[PDB]
């Protein structure tokens, strides 16, 4: 609706200013009719007062429409800033799973294009909509006061164009939605085709994907062509009868029919001429208005979706921080129906201080959900996860982020180039501490070999950082913060050989003296651990050390036999 306007004191003002501007423009045309009557009655004396009225109402109309646009644009900018502020304060408290999903193509796209389309609605269109209300609702009264017989013709032609355009809009009531459906489907086909071009180039001629794109294109073409036919055989008539020329054609012959059998007054005719002129260009932004307000209603419904979407992670700060333990208590969590991560039926396991815990999983989702859920991506349904004795559901979000220090696969880096990108935890950078934290295995040589030193720009527009060195940077950060529980996902994630040796030395420095829950896939780091847990399809199956599980005869000796065989290429 109009519910997203808390700036309505400064939009109702711009609305009334544009309405009075249109009303004084009508007053200017009426004073022009007055001055022409005075110059026809006595055509030797220059008309002085009502021509001064003409130029006064013109400069008043210009000043009022200027202040109308200034108030409307300041109101639009204030609405845009307050709406992006409420979006940022809401997206701070989104659970990071759904926010990471919308971080691909949605929440930045909505936080830009929603408020930009809201600016093009409430800035450059609502004074026009006020003018389109006010002018043909006062010009009918002026036309009826000026002539009983002559306003009927120009009113009949404008109502004729109105009923023809509304009849043309009513026949396209579903076909516009079908056109938008065809456009979104064919733009999806264009998306998959341009993403498809390299692989379908190297796998065949491209003929299958080109046919799969050409068929959706021809479907959109047939939809657009039948819409143009079925709407256009009336829409050409609507566009050609809203021209000033049929209004002139009825007006000239109505003047002739009034002159033919008497009772015709020239001044009342030229008043109807100028006001009947002034109606149509005011009423044309009402022809564009539904076209604009459809997309505006789509954008406002999108922002009401984003402003009220999540469960907001249930923030609870009503507890104290304890230390160094980690306990799963019969927890159960499944993702939303469109998400990654299969499930976790029932897991319970308790790890004291100073044990390195390896989670080994064949799934990639049974062993990732535990680390993501420990980092409070979401909340488990039925169960309790406790760092120390205290539940993390009631954990102060400062204290919880003081406890856990995490690394992952994708590992985003900011434009704070390095010395504030490593030291991002503290607001200030004690620089020599960042030197010592980058003195671990291979941060220092990769930074020192860079052309611009420790301020070599990484950012959005800098160096690629070769993938693995981003992981080395955040390893230096996680070793700088020295929070007691460190959460891994990258134990030899990227198989570059010197990067593998360097990351293993750096992780041997970083895991030392911390309750580390490490999610690996290559078991070379898993075989040196304390309590190894196996995760198949969201259920905990194994427990115990490396040797005890291998002697147990369970899933783990089979998954170990699989690995040592698959290291050798030939069988």
């Amino acid at each position: 609706w109009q519910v997203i306007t808390p700036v309505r004191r400064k939009v109702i003002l711009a609305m009334a200013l544009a309405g009075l501007a249109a009303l004084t423009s009508l007053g200017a045309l009426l004073f022009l009719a007055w001055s022409l009557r005075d110059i026809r009655a006595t055509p030797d004396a220059i008309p002085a007062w009502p021509l001064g009225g003409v130029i006064g109402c013109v400069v008043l109309t210009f000043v009022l429409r200027l202040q109308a646009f200034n108030t409307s644009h300041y109101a639009a900018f204030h609405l845009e800033n307050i709406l992006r502020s409420r979006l940022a304060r809401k997206a701070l408290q989104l659970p990071p799973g759904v926010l990471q999903q919308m971080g691909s193509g949605s929440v930045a796209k909505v936080m830009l294009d929603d408020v930009k389309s809201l600016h093009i609605f409430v800035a450059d269109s609502t004074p026009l909509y006020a003018r389109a209300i006010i002018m043909p609702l006062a010009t009918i009264v002026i036309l009826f006061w000026l002539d009983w017989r002559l306003a009927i013709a120009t009113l009949g032609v404008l109502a004729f164009g109105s009923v023809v355009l509304v009849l043309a809009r009513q026949r396209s009531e579903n076909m516009a939605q079908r056109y938008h459906k065809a456009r979104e489907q064919v733009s999806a086909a264009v998306i998959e085709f341009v993403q498809a071009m390299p692989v379908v180039r190297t796998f065949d001629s491209g003929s299958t994907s080109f046919l799969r794109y050409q068929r959706a294109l021809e479907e959109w073409v047939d939809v657009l062509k039948t819409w143009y036919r079925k709407a256009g055989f009336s829409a050409r008539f609507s566009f050609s009868i809203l021209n000033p020329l049929p209004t002139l054609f009825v007006l000239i012959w109505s003047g002739y029919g009034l002159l033919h059998y008497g009772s015709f007054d020239f001044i009342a005719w030229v008043a109807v001429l100028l006001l009947g002129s002034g109606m149509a260009e005011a009423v044309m932004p009402m022809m564009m208005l539904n076209n604009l307000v459809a997309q505006t209603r789509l954008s406002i419904q999108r922002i009401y979706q984003v402003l009220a979407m999540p469960e907001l992670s249930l923030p609870q700060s009503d507890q104290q921080p304890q230390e160094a333990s980690i306990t799963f208590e019969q927890v159960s969590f499944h993702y939303p129906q469109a998400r990654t991560g299969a499930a976790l039926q029932e897991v319970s396991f308790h790890v004291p201080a100073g044990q390195i815990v390896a989670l080994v999983g064949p799934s990639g989702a049974g062993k990732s959900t535990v680390a993501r859920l420990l980092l409070r991506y979401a909340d488990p349904d039925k169960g309790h996860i406790r760092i120390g004795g205290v539940d993390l559901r009631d954990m102060q979000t400062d204290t919880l982020m003081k406890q856990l220090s995490f690394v992952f696969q994708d590992n985003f880096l900011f434009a704070d180039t390095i010395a504030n990108n490593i030291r991002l935890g503290a607001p200030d950078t004690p620089l020599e501490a960042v030197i010592a934290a980058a003195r671990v295995a291979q941060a220092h040589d990769f930074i020192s070999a860079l052309p611009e030193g420790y301020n070599t720009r990484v950012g959005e527009r800098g160096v690629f950082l070769s993938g693995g060195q981003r992981q080395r940077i955040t390893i230096a950060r996680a070793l700088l913060q020295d929070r007691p529980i460190l959460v891994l996902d990258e134990a030899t994630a990227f198989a570059d050989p010197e990067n593998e040796a360097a990351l293993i030395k750096a992780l041997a420095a970083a895991m030392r003296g911390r309750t580390v829950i490490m999610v690996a896939h290559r078991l070379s780091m898993v075989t040196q651990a304390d309590v190894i847990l196996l995760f198949s399809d969201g259920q905990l199956r194994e427990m115990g050390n490396h040797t005890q599980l291998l002697a147990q005869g369970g899933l783990y000796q089979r998954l170990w036999q699989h690995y040592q065989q698959a290291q050798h290429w030939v069988p």
Binding site: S85, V194, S207, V270, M284, M401, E498, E500, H562
Partner: protein
Amino acid sequence: AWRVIWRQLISSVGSQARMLRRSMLALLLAAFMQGIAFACLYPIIDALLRGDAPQLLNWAMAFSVAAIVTLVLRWYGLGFEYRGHLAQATHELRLRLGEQLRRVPLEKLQRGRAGEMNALLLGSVDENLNYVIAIANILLLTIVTPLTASLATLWIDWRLGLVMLLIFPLLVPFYYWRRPAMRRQMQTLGEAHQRLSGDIVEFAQGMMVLRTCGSDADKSRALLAHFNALENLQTRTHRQGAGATMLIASVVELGLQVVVLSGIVWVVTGTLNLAFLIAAVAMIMRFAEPMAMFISYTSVVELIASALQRIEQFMAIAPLPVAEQSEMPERYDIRFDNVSYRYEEGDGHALNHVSLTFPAASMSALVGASGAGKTTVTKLLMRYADPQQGQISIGGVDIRRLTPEQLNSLISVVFQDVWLFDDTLLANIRIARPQATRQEVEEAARAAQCLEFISRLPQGWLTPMGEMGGQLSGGERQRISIARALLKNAPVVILDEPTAALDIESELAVQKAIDNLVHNRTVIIIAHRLSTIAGAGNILVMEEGQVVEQGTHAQLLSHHGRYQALWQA
């Protein structure tokens, strides 16, 4: 310029050049005859303030004749668009863009990093060319109709004619005279708007690391200060650019006032132009609606100009030179002779000065310390780009003598696939050979071991996979791609690093599938893991864009990064 827009518009419409030229002529004659009807409005009013019913009849009949003619002509000029001839125009434009995207060298397609989304965005935004008749109707009306009405009132009067001619039909050049100031200020606004979009992207992605560093509140305050700085720049720009915007929007009334004052000055003095002032005011009041339409459509004019410029720039790049295209070899001994290819000019000689030999019916390996380097040669073998110096050859025949078709069906590449495009998986296997039946798809799926997992998967080989293509592990995705390259019996197979996903399912199934595929085949494995490379028969080490020691495994054991590379495993 304004003639280059017409040339690019008459070319990129396509085979409707005759209908577009006919409709441009229809709209020009329609605007011109409407202006002549507006001139015929003059002696109507001159007869009308007197009695003169015969004069009013003898000119209103001509007004009806010159009104019906231009209304019919505007009806045909828009009947270019509303019979449907623009749908065929943009359809032919998009089907020419499709064949040009299928014919483009992949080098420009990939090295255009912004050019990727640029080509995708233009191919999706080419429905913005729908405005071309509703903009050639408004612009042409606003320039021609006041010009012909004014060139007729030069014959009715002298001075009202010059005041009308200098002001009203030159209004569209008086807008494009003041346009580049608005384009510069809109550039200043759009640059900060794009910087804000980049900062929002950075916030939304790095939310998680921003929260675990504990500084989420600080970057929230930084984003709120950035929002207030953007609103203050928007207000400071709009406050100093609203005068020109309001003058341009009300220039038709502020030009009407000049005619009203000057005409009254002429009426009261002895040069009694009688009611031609009233008719001229009633004429140039009705130039308000097309000018108000044109100032609404000018942003679409700029988008149409940029789209046509980008289209004529995009369809000007040509495929690779193909000299003596009739050959196709049968002696698949891939040979490279002094190849030096410049990926980007910032880091020249990316694949510098190589000389390779991949002998037939064997496996030859590439190894290196970078993602590129040893994958740029596997790009060059697919005719990604012409080598800047040197020759590349499948046997005795150079690659430049082959078609893109014979080369793109001669070899088969396997990499980390992000595809299958949300449909049946029988077609996703059979897309490498549409001339392959149902009995060979199951043969390839049995020889590439995706068969047990796809029988475990539901829907029984119908299998729409409509949940964005991915609901399964990447390891069986790799088995699908291996079966796809196995179906097309290509005598040269390029392998990427095909083993990076899991331990049991991905690694064992993909190893079982790949060790089937290498049999009497020239294959190029470029995986970094020196065990699978150590099993091979010919070793090429790519060290900073140049090979250094080509030989067998013992030649790698001669002098290398030997002990570290074998110790890290």
